[PDB]
Amino acid sequence: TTALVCDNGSGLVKAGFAGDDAPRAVFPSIVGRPRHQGVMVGMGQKDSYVGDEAQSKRGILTLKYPIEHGIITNWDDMEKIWHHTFYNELRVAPEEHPTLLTEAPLNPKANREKMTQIMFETFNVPAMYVAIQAVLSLYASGRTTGIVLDSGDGVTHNVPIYEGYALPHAIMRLDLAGRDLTDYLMKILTERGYSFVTTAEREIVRDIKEKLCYVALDFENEMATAASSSSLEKSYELPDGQVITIGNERFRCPETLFQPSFIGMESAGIHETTYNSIMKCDIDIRKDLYANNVMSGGTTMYPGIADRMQKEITALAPSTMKIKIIAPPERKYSVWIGGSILASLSTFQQMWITKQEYDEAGPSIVH
Amino acid sequence: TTALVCDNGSGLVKAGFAGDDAPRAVFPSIVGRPRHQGVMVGMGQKDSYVGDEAQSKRGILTLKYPIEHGIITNWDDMEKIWHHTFYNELRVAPEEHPTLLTEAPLNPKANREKMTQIMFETFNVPAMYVAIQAVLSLYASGRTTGIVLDSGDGVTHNVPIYEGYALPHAIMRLDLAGRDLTDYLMKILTERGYSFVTTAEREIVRDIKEKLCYVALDFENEMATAASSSSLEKSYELPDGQVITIGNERFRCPETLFQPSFIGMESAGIHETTYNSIMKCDIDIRKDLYANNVMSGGTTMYPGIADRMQKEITALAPSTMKIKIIAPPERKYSVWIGGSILASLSTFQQMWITKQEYDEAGPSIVH
Amino acid sequence: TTALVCDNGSGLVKAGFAGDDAPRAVFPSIVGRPRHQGVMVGMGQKDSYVGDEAQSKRGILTLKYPIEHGIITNWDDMEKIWHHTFYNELRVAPEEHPTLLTEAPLNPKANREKMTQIMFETFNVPAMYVAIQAVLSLYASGRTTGIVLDSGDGVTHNVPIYEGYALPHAIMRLDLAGRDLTDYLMKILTERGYSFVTTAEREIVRDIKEKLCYVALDFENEMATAASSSSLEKSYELPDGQVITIGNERFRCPETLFQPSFIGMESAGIHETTYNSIMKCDIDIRKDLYANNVMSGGTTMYPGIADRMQKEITALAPSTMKIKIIAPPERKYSVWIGGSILASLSTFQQMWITKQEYDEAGPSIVH
Ligand SMILES: Nc1ncnc2c1ncn2[C@@H]1O[C@H](COP(=O)(O)OP(=O)(O)O)[C@@H](O)[C@H]1O
Ligand SMILES: Nc1ncnc2c1ncn2[C@@H]1O[C@H](COP(=O)(O)OP(=O)(O)O)[C@@H](O)[C@H]1O
Numbered sequence A, B, C: 001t002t003a004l005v006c007d008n009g010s011g012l013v014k015a016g017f018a019g020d021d022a023p024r025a026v027f028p029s030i031v032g033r034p035r036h037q038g039v040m041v042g043m044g045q046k047d048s049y050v051g052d053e054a055q056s057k058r059g060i061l062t063l064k065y066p067i068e069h070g071i072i073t074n075w076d077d078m079e080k081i082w083h084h085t086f087y088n089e090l091r092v093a094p095e096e097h098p099t100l101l102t103e104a105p106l107n108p109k110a111n112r113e114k115m116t117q118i119m120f121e122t123f124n125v126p127a128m129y130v131a132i133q134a135v136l137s138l139y140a141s142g143r144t145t146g147i148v149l150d151s152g153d154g155v156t157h158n159v160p161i162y163e164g165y166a167l168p169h170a171i172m173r174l175d176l177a178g179r180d181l182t183d184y185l186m187k188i189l190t191e192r193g194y195s196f197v198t199t200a201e202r203e204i205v206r207d208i209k210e211k212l213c214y215v216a217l218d219f220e221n222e223m224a225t226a227a228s229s230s231s232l233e234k235s236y237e238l239p240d241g242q243v244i245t246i247g248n249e250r251f252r253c254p255e256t257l258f259q260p261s262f263i264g265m266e267s268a269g270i271h272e273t274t275y276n277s278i279m280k281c282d283i284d285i286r287k288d289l290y291a292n293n294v295m296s297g298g299t300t301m302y303p304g305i306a307d308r309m310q311k312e313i314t315a316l317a318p319s320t321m322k323i324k325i326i327a328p329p330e331r332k333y334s335v336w337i338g339g340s341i342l343a344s345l346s347t348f349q350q351m352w353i354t355k356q357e358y359d360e361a362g363p364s365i366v367h
């Protein structure tokens, strides 16, 4: 009996055993379905396709993301990947040990009950629990105080924490980055005349985001520095072998996190959504936060995200104070790393909710 | 020459002539600005938008409230609505007759000088005066003694009055209700999975507050009475025509006024902030107050606010005494009603401060 | 066996061993409790928090003062700090040596019995005694005659003494200064537009009182001298790093002690509450008092308290007489300094009341 912990963060969903520095199985969550007539009537490949079964064979498939924004749009496709995650991929019996399932802070409650539901009546699990995407970032870093910053594909959220006491009233969540950061790119490639739009090809575009973006670090010149003297085009090769030329939007896609008037849906932006999350915290309590904001987003490995938060918060915020954005490279597994830590440790062991608790009243005890 | 009286209480700002039972122009105070590219290069609608000019066309606009908490955050956007209030809306020349401008009790002084300022050097007014949000509630009710209770969008405050003699040391002001009552709702809708967050949509949410809230009236059962036997969901239609289902939080939003540990910012709560305002009043003087508390808040039409103050003060307070919360339905214009009364009447006529007084020393005579 | 002596004066409560020039442990008396959801289920910090355990971590906590005005409002929270004061902080076994516990002159008797009670049946003490806040000020100064003046946070009181013979009929106690001097400041900061109000932040404000107040020293000009020519604003930095500007109320908060018509609760004021305490003393006996008034208040280090008592009593009082306000800088520990003196000395040794005396009849012998 040992805890297997998994997150729903869309993108690559991530699952592994407790007491480990990295999960065993990391694969993207997608259900593919064939969109064309079956000809080899027998073939030798499945009806529908999950994960890298699907991710390998793309264009022939159409791709559906069950995780939509932390919230899950369809259940029945979703439970497949859980059905898969445990059996194939990492191979584990249904009933061994509890499972910590991380999950988004502000999303609706009807999200996690049916989730706990299908963690019980369909395939029974030895108890269960659901943590918060944020808090596990600290259990990873070993921090106690501090304000996280998450993006991932699922949703962008930050939850300032001080000594294991959350500040719910200060929880700021804007639904952005992730997919919506790529979708803006497929929007903005046609600038260069590459029309990529289909659901299967999206994950070619995502790879372009992966390899070359960075972050503006003061884009004014950076728009000029692109146009005027262009050494910064980085050509790229995509699976057919056709050339690409980019570099005007290499930084312009991640730049949207600092001005979501480019994406067109105006809310805040990630740099000052933390500051406004601080301002709602206490006058005293906020001093240390400026030092401690951990930012494990799972999107943001961007080379120079830190720089432009270091840059931008200083324009905001008390001048006399030392603002420190810690940027652990080991993140992007962090919200999982919290799991294999928080679960494998004890004083949490009684905090699993046994099937008895689901037997007590219902799924409704999660709240 | 006849007095036009106006209040700043954010929400719907309210202005009309003296000697009338209701103001002529009532519109919400917002400056809208277009957030997207102008395409119809000529169109036929203004650069920026105030009030119902803006309130009509929302999602395209971004909305800014110059009144923030009685205190005004930006002046230059603010003076627009005054510039507008007099010219369009109710149409009045700059210089006719003085104007009574109501204003919050405890807010900083730098608030009302520049206000008086721009009531003079930019567009000159035939004198001026600024009353208190509280006191005009009595001039409306015709009461003399009694403790008001105000909420409105601007700020929550109560000022016990006994025979035209205020008790400043007993003035209790907690900054709450109003906007911060709605902002908690947009927080708490996502409970049901409706993510409404944008500045333009907020005033859809505000309408939901408007139509269906009431007040807990003993919420313990009321949380159970919601969950267990649910007949109380009231569905609602919002301008697209999409359905909504509510009723778990219908009473849970106004409930925050009685436990501002739900909003997360802990101060007091409105029921016992009056009692604690009484306790700071005299031992004798307090008997009648328990009978007289008028509560014209401008937010609180809630069906059953009175009940739960009647309920809660009795749990507090001397038992042998008869506590009476009068709940005039004509309120929400009350703090204006005081104006058209106090101004149109006389023995106040010498109390206007003429431009001469502003010419005497400066704006500083208001204190 | 050596006497440990402690005072309840709220503010910083102060305890140390007999025969020393200053107590070992000086910390503020507060019981903090977490007001938000526990998230780090294990953390590593206590259920509830006392003193600097609490004083370090503020905004997350809510703060309760068991000492209210010398009178103690809640016992069970109170006994914690005593439970703490002896064990942690200065570390001492329950039963070693008696303890002198200072305490307010005019407060109710039900105050000190239960106090003596919980000094016995819960944790037994080798006898006990309770002196007066006033008298120990002289045992410190080594004076015999003279009228004290106390403020502290607990209560303001002055007890004229002549050769170890108190004048009870002349004891003047007005409940003021201390907390109620700060609470007036949080009232009067919003003048400048700083809304500080929450229980945890209060002790930021208290620090502002600490560093910059002084005393009017003839405020008429001093209100003008502030307004007209302003060099006297002293900006300040508070734990976030946000700027403050003050100086109109720097002297206006302590000024309330000379006109408690600013605080709104009208009693007397500290300058002429001593003179009226003198007038109730004998015609002969009063000559020397005017020379001897010691004023160890524990609040009043204010730079120029002495000046405005020197100033004000002269306006009162016989002209031909030399009025001398001695202002020992070593005070604010004084009422403790009396303890380590009066206890460590002898001829008081038989005046401890042994558990036998509590065994004789009950706690009731204190009177
Ligand atoms: N090096 C990188 N640079 C930019 N974006 C990245 C990089 N690595 C991953 N991403 C984006 O971040 C996402 C991380 O997804 P995931 O961590 O599962 O979301 P969540 O944080 O909600 O779990 C990926 O889907 C990818 O789109
Ligand atoms: N029937 C109602 N039920 C609940 N809330 C209401 C109702 N009518 C108005 N409100 C809220 O009360 C506010 C009143 O604003 P307003 O009176 O201008 O503030 P002030 O009292 O400071 O002038 C409105 O903005 C609205 O949010």
Ligand SMILES: Nc1ncnc2c1ncn2[C@@H]1O[C@H](COP(=O)(O)OP(=O)(O)O)[C@@H](O)[C@H]1O
Pocket (backbone or CB within 6 Å): C007, C008, C009, C010, C011, C012, C013, C151, C152, C153, C154, C155, C178, C179, C206, C209, C210, C211, C213, C297, C298, C299, C300, C301, C302, C332, C335
């Ligand atoms: N330098 C200072 N200037 C002004 N006020 C002070 C200063 N030092 C302390 N105080 C106030 O005086 C209080 C002293 O509290 P304390 O001496 O415990 O009360 P008591 O005199 O009843 O024991 C402090 O809480 C603080 O508010």
